[PDB]
């Protein structure tokens, strides 16, 4: 991986720096590294492909070195370098694709393609140089068993889940108490609804709780908490849990009461915020516990008093909503997010070449299934393919 990354980094530096007119002083170290790469790769045969519709390709390296005597680079020098650069970029792209489409259960961190396994040999380490990208840096830290860290803008940590739990229900679904939620990506919208507006509740207060378990620990998380759930604030007809019938929901939104968000790690309260909205910081957590309350307004105007009667029928259902959006976080594991492209690249390559479903990832590289069952083996394979995808994105 480090060797593949170094090949790609050398090729990218050669593309960016070996340009017409530049001082040889600008490129001298790069020229030495490039010639070293030529020397190391020369006489070596590789085979990529042979999986799905990815075509089998044979790679032979017998190249000349670049000159070193120029004061400034001319057109001839650039074209000479560019021919070799093109062949090498094609090779690296094919190796990256051949690795991205393969997976293993027991040893998914280790290379899977024959070419990358060959490139893991000792003799190729001469190519190795500056490993500065976030993904290769985390790869090297994980290989050295150091603490790893990935920054994610809007991490896709929550699998898609639009569900409801009814704590008070009848076959006619007209005096309903419960909560409904959407967890998706970095967003959690929750809404507790009481059809009776907690008239029969002990202190005219209905307590609602929502626990969400993150499949990985998040640290240094900037979260925005807002006191309404626009997703559960309009009328809708919702299936029943068995799907037999449909019930009606006619929200009227009251502000949530005694809002308490707990960020927990291993069941221990790490962070806690009461009646706090806007930006909050969860420093280290794996569970989010949202507790809120519907408090029946003690004093009502005639319209409000008309909305909420003493007994049934209940046509206006009191609703209190919370919205929790993780804008940025750090995770020790790779995750899909909104700014990066590794997942899209891996899925795109798996789709364009019709890769059969393997024993590690869910079909189609579907993120919801992957993150719902994010096992250590899946994490290893995903870190491998994501590092490969980043290395590929350096060139392609």
């Amino acid at each position: 991986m480090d060797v593949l990354y170094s090949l790609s980094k050398t090729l990218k530096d050669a593309r960016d720096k070996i340009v017409e007119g530049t001082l040889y002083s600008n490129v001298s170290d790069l020229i030495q590294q490039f010639n070293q790469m030529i020397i190391t790769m020369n006489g070596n045969e590789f085979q990529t492909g042979g999986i799905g519709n990815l075509p089998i390709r044979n790679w032979n390296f017998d190249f000349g070195l670049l000159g070193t005597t120029l004061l400034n680079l001319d057109a001839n020098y650039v074209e000479t370098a560019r021919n070799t650069i093109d062949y090498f970029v094609d090779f690296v792209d094919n190796v990256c694709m051949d690795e991205m489409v393969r997976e293993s259960q027991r040893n998914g961190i280790a290379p899977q393609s024959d070419s990358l396994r060959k490139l893991s040999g000792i003799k190729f380490k001469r190519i190795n140089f500056d490993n500065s990208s976030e993904y290769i840096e985390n790869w090297n830290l994980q290989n050295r068993r150091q603490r790893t860290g990935f920054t994610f803008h809007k991490p896709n940590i929550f699998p898609y889940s639009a569900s409801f739990t009814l704590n008070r229900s009848q076959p006619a679904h007209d005096n309903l108490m419960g909560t409904m939620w959407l967890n998706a990506g970095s967003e959690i919208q929750v809404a507790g609804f009481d059809y009776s507006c907690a008239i029969n509740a002990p202190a005219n207060i209905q307590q609602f709780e929502h626990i969400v378990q993150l499949r990985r620990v998040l640290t240094t998380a900037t979260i925005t908490l807002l006191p309404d759930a626009e997703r559960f604030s309009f009328p809708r007809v919702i299936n029943s849990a068995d799907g037999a019938t449909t019930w009606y929901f006619n929200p009227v939104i009251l502000r949530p009461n005694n809002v308490e968000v707990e960020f927990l790690l291993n069941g221990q309260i790490i962070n806690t915020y009461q009646a706090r909205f806007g930006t909050i910081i969860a420093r280290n957590f794996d569970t989010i516990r949202l507790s809120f309350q519907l408090m029946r307004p003690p004093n009502m105007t005639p319209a409000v008093a008309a909305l909420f009667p003493n007994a049934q029928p209940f046509e206006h259902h009191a609703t209190v909503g919370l919205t929790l959006r993780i804008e940025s976080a750090v995770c020790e594991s790779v995750l899909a997010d909104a700014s990066k492209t590794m997942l899209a690249n891996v899925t795109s390559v798996r789709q364009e070449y019709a890769i059969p479903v393997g024993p590690v990832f869910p079909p189609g590289m579907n993120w919801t299934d992957l993150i719902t069952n994010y096992s250590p083996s899946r994490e290893d394979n995903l870190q491998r393919v994501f590092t490969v995808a980043s290395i590929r994105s350096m060139l392609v």
Partner: protein, 271 residues
Amino acid sequence: NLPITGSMDTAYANSTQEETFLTSTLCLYYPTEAATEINDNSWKDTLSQLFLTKGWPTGSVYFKEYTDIASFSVDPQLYCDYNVVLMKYDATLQLDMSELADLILNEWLCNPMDITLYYYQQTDEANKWISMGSSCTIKVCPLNTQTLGIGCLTTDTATFEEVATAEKLVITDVVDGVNHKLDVTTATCTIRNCKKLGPRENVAVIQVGGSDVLDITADPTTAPQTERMMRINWKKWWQVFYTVVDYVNQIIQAMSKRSRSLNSAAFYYRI
């Protein structure tokens, strides 16, 4: 009762209307004048065959007759899984019909009221005194902490305030938190301390003719018309029964299985 968790992505099951019609029974309650005007001894068979065309098995739709609203209100025993009461409208009986609806469109938890030895009160807005019989004449004497009467003497019933006279059914609602001495004819009436639990979903009331007058809630600020309270204009009873048969699916969609577990052991027309 346990929490129920559902997925909003779940797929709708097919229509269960056919199966519920096959496995349930429908009781129709109509006034005797309807049978008088129809003037046909086989009309029960005709309505049963039409309901069979609508899906219901032969022998599941039960037809029950009552003389009038006042009489039917004496301990109405609704039998089938689904009950439809064709209640005639009279401008003079707006309360009584409402009371009847209030008696059959809601669940009630009732206990005996032995007035002649005990003093009674209504704790909350759901507590009512439901009195049923041949002649329910109920007089009330409000009391107080000193055990005296307010505009009434416990030793003289003539001073008891009048709230019901010659009633087959009446719901009495008095001021909560106050003890009342009661004077009712136990011979021709039985009064029970009752709490309305909630709507009774297996009972629909179709008001034949008239306007919207039903008030099944004692609160003056609410007159809610649930889906189970229908109202049809009429000139012939055959048209009334034809519309009840034709829109039976619509009528049952407005109703739901009772779901209440009772302490009583009554008779039912069930399959």
